[PDB]
Short mmCIF file of C-alpha atoms and ligand atoms in Angstrom, two decimals:
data_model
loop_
_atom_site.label_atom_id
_atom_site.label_comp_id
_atom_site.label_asym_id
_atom_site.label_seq_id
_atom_site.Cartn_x
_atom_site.Cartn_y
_atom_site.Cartn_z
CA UNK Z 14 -4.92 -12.38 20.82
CA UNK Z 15 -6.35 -12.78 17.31
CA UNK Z 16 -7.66 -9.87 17.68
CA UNK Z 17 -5.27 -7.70 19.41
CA UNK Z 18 -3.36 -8.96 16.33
CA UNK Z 19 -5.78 -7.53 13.51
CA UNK Z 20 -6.71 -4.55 15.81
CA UNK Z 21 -2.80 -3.38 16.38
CA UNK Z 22 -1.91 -3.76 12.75
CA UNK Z 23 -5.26 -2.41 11.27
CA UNK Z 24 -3.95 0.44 13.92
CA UNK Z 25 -0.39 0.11 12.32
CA UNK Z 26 -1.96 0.52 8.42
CA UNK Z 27 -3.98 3.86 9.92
CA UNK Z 28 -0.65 5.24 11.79
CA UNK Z 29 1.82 4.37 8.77
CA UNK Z 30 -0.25 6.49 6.16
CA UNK Z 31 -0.77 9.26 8.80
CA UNK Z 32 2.81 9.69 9.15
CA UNK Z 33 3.80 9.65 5.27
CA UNK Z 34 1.12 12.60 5.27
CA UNK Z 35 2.09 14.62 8.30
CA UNK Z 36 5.98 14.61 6.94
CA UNK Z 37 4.45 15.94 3.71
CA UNK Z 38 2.24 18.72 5.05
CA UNK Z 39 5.30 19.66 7.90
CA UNK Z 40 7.78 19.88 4.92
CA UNK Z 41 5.24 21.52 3.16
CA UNK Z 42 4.59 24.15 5.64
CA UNK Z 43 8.01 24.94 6.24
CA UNK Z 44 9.03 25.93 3.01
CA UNK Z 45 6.10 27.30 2.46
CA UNK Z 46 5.96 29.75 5.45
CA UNK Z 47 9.81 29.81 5.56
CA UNK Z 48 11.08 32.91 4.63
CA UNK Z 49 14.85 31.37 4.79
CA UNK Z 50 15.06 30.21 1.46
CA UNK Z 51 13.35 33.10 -0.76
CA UNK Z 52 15.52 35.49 0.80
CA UNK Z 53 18.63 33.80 -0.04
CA UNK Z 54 16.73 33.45 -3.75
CA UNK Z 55 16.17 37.37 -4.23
CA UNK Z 56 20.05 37.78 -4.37
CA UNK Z 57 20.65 34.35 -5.94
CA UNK Z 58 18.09 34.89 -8.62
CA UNK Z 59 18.87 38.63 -8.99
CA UNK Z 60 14.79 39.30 -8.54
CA UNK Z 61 15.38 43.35 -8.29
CA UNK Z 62 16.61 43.16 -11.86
CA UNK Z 63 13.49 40.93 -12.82
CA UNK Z 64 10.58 42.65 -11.18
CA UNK Z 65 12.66 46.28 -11.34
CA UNK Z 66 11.68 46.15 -7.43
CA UNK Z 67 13.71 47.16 -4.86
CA UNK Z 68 15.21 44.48 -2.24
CA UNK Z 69 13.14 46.12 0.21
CA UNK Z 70 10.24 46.48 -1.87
CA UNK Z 71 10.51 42.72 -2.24
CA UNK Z 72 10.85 42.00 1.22
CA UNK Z 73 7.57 43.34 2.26
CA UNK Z 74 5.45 42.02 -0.94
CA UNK Z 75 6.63 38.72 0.42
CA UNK Z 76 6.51 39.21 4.11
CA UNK Z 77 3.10 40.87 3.49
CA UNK Z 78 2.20 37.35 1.30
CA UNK Z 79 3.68 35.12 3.46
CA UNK Z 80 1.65 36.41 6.30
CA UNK Z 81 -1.50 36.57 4.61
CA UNK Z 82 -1.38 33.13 3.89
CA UNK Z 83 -1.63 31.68 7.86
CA UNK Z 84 -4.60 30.32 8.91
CA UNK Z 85 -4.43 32.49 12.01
CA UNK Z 86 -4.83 35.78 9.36
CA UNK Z 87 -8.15 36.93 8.87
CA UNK Z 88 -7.43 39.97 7.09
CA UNK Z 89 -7.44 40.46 3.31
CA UNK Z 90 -4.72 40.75 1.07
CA UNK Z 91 -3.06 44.36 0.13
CA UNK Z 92 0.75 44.33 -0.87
CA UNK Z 93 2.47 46.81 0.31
CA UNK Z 94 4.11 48.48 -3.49
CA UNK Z 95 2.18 45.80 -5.82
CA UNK Z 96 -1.24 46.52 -6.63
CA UNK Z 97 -3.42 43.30 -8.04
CA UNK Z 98 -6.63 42.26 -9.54
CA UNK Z 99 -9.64 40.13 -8.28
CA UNK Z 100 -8.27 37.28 -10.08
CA UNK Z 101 -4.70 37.48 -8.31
CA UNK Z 102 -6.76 37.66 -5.01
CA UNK Z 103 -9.13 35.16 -6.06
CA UNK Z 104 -6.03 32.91 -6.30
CA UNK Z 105 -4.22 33.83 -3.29
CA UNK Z 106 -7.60 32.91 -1.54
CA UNK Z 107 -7.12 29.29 -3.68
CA UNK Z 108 -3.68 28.57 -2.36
CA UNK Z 109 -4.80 29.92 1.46
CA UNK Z 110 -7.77 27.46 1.09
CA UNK Z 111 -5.36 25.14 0.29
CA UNK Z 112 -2.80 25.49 2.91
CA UNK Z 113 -5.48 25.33 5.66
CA UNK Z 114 -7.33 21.78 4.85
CA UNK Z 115 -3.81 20.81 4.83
CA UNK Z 116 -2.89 21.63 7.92
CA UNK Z 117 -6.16 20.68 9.34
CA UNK Z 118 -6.07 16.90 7.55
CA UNK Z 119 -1.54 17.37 9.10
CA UNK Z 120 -3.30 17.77 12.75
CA UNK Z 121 -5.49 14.65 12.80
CA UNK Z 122 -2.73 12.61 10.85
CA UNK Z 123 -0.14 13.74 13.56
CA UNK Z 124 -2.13 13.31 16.29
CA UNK Z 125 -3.25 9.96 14.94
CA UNK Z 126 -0.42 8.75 14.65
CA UNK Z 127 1.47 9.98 17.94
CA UNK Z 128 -0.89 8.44 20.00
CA UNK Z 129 -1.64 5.41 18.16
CA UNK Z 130 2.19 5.22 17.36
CA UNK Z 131 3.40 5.51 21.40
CA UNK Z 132 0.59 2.70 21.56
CA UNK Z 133 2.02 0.39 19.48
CA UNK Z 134 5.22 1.32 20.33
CA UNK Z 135 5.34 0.66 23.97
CA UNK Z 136 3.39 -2.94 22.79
CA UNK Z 137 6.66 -3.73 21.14
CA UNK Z 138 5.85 -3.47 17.92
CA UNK Z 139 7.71 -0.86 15.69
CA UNK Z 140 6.12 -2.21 12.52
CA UNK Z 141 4.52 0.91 11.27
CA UNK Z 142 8.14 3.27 11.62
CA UNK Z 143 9.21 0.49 8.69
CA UNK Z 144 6.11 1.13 6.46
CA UNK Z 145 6.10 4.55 7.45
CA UNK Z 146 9.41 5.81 5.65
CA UNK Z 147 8.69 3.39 2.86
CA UNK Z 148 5.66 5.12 2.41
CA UNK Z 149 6.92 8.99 2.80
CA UNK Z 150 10.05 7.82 0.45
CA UNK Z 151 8.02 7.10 -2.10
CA UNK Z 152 6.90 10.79 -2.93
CA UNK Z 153 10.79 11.86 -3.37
CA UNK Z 154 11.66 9.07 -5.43
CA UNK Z 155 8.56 9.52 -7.48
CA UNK Z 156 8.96 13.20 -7.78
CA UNK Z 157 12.67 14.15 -7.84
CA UNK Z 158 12.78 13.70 -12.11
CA UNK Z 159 9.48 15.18 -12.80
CA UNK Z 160 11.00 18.53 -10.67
CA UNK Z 161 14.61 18.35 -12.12
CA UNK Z 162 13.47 17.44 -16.00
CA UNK Z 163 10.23 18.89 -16.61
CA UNK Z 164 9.07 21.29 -13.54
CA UNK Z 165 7.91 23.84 -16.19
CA UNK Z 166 5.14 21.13 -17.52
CA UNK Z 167 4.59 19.33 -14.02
CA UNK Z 168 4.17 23.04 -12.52
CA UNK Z 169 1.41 23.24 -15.20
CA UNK Z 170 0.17 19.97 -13.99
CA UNK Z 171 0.29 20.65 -10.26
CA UNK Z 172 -1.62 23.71 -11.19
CA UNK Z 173 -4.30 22.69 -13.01
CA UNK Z 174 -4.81 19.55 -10.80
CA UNK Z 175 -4.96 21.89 -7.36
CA UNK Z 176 -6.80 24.74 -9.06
CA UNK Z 177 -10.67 24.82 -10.69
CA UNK Z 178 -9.91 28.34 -12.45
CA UNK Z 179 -7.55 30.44 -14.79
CA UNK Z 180 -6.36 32.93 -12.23
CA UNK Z 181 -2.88 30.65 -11.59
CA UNK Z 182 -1.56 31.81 -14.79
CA UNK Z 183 -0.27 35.97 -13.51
CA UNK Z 184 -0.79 38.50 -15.98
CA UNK Z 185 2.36 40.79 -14.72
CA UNK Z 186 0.57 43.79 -15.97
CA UNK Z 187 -2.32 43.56 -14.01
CA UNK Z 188 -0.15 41.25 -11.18
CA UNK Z 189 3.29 42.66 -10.95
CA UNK Z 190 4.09 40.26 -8.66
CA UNK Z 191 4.59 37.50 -10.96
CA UNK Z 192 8.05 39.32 -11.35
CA UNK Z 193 9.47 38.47 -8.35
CA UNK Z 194 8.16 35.00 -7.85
CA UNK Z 195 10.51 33.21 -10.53
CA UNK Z 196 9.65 29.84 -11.63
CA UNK Z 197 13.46 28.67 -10.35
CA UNK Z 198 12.11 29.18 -6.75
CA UNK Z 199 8.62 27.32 -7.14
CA UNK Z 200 11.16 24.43 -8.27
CA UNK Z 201 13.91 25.06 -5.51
CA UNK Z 202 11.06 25.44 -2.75
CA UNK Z 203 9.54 21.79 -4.49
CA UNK Z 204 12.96 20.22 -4.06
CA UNK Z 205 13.46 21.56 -0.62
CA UNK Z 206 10.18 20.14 0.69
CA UNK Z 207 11.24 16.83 -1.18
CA UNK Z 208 14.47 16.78 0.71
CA UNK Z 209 12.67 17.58 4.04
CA UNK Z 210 10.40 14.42 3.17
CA UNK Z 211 13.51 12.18 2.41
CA UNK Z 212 14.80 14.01 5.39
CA UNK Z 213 11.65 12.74 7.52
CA UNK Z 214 11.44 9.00 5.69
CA UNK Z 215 15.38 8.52 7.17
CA UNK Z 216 14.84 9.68 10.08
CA UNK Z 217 11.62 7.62 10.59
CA UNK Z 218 13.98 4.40 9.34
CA UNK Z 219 16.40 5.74 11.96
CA UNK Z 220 14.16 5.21 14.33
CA UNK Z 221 12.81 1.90 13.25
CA UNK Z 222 16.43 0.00 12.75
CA UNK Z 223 17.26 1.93 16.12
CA UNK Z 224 14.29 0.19 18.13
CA UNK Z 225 14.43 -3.52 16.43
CA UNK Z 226 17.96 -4.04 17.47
CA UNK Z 227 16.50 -3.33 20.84
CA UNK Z 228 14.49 -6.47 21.42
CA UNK Z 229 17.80 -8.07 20.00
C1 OLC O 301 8.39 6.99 22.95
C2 OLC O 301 9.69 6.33 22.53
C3 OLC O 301 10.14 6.78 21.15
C4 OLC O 301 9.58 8.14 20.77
C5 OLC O 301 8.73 8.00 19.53
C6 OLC O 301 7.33 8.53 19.80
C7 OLC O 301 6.33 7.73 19.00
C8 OLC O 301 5.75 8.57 17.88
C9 OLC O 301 5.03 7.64 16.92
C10 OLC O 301 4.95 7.88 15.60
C11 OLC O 301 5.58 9.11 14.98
C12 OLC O 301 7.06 8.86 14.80
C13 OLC O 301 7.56 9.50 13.53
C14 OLC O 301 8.96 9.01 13.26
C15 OLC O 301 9.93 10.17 13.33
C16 OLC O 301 9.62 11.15 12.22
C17 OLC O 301 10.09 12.53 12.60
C18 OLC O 301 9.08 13.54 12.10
O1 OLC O 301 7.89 13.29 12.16
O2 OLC O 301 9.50 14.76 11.55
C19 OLC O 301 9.15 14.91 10.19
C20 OLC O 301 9.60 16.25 9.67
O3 OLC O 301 9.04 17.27 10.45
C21 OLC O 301 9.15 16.40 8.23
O4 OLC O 301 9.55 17.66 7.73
C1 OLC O 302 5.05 16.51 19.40
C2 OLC O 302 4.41 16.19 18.07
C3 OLC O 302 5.45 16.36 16.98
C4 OLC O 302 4.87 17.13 15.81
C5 OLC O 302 5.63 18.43 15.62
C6 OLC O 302 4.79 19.65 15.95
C7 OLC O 302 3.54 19.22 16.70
C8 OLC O 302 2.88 20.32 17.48
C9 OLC O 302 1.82 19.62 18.32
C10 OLC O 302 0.57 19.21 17.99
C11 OLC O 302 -0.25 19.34 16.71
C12 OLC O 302 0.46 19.52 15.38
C13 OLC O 302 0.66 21.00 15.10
C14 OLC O 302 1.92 21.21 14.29
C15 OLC O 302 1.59 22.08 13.10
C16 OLC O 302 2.22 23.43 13.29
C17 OLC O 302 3.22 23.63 12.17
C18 OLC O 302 2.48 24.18 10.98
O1 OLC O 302 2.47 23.56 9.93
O2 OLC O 302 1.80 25.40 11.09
C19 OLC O 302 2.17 26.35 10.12
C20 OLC O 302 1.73 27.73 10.55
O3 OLC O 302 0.36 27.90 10.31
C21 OLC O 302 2.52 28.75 9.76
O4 OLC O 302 2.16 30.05 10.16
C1 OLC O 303 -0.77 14.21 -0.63
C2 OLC O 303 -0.70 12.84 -1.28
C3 OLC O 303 -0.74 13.00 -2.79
C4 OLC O 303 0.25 14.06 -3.21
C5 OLC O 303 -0.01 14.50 -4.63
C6 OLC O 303 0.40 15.95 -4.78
C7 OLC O 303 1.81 16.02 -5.34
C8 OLC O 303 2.46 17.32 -4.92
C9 OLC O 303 3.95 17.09 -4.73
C10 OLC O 303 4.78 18.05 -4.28
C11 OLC O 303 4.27 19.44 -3.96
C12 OLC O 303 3.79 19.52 -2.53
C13 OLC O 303 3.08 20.84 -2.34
C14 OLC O 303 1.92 20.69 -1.38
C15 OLC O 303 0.89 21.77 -1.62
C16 OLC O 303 1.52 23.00 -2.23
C17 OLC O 303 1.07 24.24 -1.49
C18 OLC O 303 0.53 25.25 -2.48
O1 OLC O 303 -0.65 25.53 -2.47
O2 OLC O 303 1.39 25.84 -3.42
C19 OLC O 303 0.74 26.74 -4.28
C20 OLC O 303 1.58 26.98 -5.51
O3 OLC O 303 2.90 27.28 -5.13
C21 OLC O 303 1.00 28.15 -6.26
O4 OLC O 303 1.78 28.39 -7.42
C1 OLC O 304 19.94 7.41 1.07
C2 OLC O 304 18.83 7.74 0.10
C3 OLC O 304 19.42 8.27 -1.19
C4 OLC O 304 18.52 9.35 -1.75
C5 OLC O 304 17.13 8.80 -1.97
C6 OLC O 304 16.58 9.34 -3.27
C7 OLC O 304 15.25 10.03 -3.02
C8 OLC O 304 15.24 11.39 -3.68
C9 OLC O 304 15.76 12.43 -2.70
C10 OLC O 304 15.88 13.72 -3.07
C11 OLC O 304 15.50 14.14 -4.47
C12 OLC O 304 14.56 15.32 -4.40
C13 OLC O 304 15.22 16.54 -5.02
C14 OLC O 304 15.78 16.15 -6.37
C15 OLC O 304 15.50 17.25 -7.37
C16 OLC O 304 16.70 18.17 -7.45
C17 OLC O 304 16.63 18.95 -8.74
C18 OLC O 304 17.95 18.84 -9.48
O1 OLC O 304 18.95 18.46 -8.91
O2 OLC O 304 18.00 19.20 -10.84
C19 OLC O 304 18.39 20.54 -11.04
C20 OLC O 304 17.55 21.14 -12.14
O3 OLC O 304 17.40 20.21 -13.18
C21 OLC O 304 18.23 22.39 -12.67
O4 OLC O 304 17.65 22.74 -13.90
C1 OLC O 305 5.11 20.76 -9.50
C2 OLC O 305 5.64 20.78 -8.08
C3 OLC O 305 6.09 22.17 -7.72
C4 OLC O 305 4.92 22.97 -7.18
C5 OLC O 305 5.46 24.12 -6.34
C6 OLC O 305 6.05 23.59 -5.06
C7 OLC O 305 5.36 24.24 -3.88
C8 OLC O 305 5.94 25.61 -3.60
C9 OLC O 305 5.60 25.98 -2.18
C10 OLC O 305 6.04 27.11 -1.60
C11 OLC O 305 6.91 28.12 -2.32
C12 OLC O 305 6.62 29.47 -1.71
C13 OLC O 305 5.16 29.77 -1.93
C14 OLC O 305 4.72 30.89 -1.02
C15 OLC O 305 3.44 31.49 -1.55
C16 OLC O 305 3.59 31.75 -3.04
C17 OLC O 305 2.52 32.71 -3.50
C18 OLC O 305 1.81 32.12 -4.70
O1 OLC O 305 0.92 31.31 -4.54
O2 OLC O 305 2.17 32.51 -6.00
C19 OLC O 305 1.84 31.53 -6.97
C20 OLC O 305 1.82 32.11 -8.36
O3 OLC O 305 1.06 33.30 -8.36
C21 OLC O 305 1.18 31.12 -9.30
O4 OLC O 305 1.83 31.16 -10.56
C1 OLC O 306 21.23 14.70 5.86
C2 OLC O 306 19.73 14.62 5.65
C3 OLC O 306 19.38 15.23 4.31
C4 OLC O 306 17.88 15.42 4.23
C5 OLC O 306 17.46 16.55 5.15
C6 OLC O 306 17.44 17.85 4.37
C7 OLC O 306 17.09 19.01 5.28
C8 OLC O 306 17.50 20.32 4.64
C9 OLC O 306 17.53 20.18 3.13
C10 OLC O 306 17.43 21.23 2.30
C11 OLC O 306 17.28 22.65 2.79
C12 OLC O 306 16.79 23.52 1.65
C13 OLC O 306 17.73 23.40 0.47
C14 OLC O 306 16.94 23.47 -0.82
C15 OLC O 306 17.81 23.93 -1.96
C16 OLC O 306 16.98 23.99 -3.22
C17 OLC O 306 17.87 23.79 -4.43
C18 OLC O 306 17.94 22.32 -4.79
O1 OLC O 306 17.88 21.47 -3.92
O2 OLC O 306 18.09 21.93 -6.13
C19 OLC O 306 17.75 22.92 -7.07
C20 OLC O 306 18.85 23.05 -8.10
O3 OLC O 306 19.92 23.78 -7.54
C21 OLC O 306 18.34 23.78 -9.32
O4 OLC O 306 19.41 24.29 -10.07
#
């Protein structure tokens, strides 16, 4: 028993973190692979007058993106109407690498935490769905000024902390797709994934609130 007491709450410190990270990478990989939102943006944004593309033309670039960027896509990348340079597809290959050690770090922290969670949940002990949405609330709160004041300098930021080369920065000539990615969807897409991780930290409080007036 003081054991079981260590044991169970070292197990509710290792479950709490690895469900503040799994709500970031599922957010994460639903805006990023949801194709919901940019559509809505091409109108919204008027991207056929920026990149003088077509609505269809934009379409496909992005469907064609979108689905080279899966981890189950071996293929290279070729856009359908854009053409690009080793650098763009040196960085496409960056954000790709990117997206899968996330996902493959998302499938140890969700399983982690599912079955250590059900274990300390059916022990009566809901301890870690408290520390969990304090802990996935925090990246909102931190992060909803730095998006809504000064996304153009934190995108620089994000950049240069996620990438080890120049080839973020799209020379349109050489990259004409540049033109229809808009910085005002980058920071719509960042505040959708920060509303899907609020999203996650209330319903994760839901949840705990729910199951402690249940022993009471
Ligand atoms: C079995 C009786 C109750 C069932 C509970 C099973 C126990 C699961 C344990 C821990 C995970 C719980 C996570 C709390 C809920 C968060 C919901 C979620 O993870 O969704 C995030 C969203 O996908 C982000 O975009
Ligand atoms: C029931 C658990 C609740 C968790 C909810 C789903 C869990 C699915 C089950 C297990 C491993 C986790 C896999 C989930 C990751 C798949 C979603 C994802 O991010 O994949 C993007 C995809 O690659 C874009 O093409
Ligand atoms: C994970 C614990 C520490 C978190 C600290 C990081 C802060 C990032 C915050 C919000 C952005 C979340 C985005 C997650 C990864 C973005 C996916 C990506 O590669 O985007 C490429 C970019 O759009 C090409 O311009
Ligand atoms: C009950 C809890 C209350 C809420 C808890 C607070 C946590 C933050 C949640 C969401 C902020 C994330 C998105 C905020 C960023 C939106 C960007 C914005 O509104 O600014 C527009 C932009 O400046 C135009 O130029
Ligand atoms: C500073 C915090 C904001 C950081 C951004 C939030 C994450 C955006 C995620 C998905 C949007 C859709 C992305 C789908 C793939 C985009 C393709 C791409 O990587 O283009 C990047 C551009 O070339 C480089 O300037
Ligand atoms: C009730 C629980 C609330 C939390 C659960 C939320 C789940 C869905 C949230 C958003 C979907 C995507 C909407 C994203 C819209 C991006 C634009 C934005 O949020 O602010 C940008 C601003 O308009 C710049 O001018």
């Amino acid at each position: 028993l003081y054991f079981q007491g260590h044991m169970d709450r070292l197990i509710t410190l290792v479950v709490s973190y690895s469900i503040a990270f799994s709500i970031f990478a599922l957010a994460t990989m639903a805006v990023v692979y949801g194709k919901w939102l940019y559509y809505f943006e091409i109108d919204f944004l008027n991207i056929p007058d920026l990149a003088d593309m077509t609505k269809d033309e934009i379409k496909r670039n992005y469907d064609v993106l979108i689905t080279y960027l899966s981890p189950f896509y071996d293929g290279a990348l070729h856009l359908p109407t854009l053409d690009m340079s080793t650098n763009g597809r040196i960085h496409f290959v960056d954000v790709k690498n990117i997206l899968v050690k996330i996902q493959y770090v998302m499938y140890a922290t969700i399983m982690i935490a599912v079955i250590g969670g059900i274990y300390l949940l059916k022990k009566k002990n809901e301890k870690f769905l408290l520390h969990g949405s304090i802990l996935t609330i925090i990246f909102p709160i931190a992060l909803m000024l730095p998006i809504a004041i000064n996304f153009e300098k934190s995108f620089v930021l994000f950049h240069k902390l996620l990438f080890s080369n120049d080839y973020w920065v799209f020379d349109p000539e050489k990259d004409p797709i540049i033109l229809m990615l808009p910085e005002e969807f980058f920071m719509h897409a960042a505040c959708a994934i920060l509303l899907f991780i609020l999203g996650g930290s209330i319903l994760c409080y839901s949840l705990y609130r729910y199951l402690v007036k249940k022993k009471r």
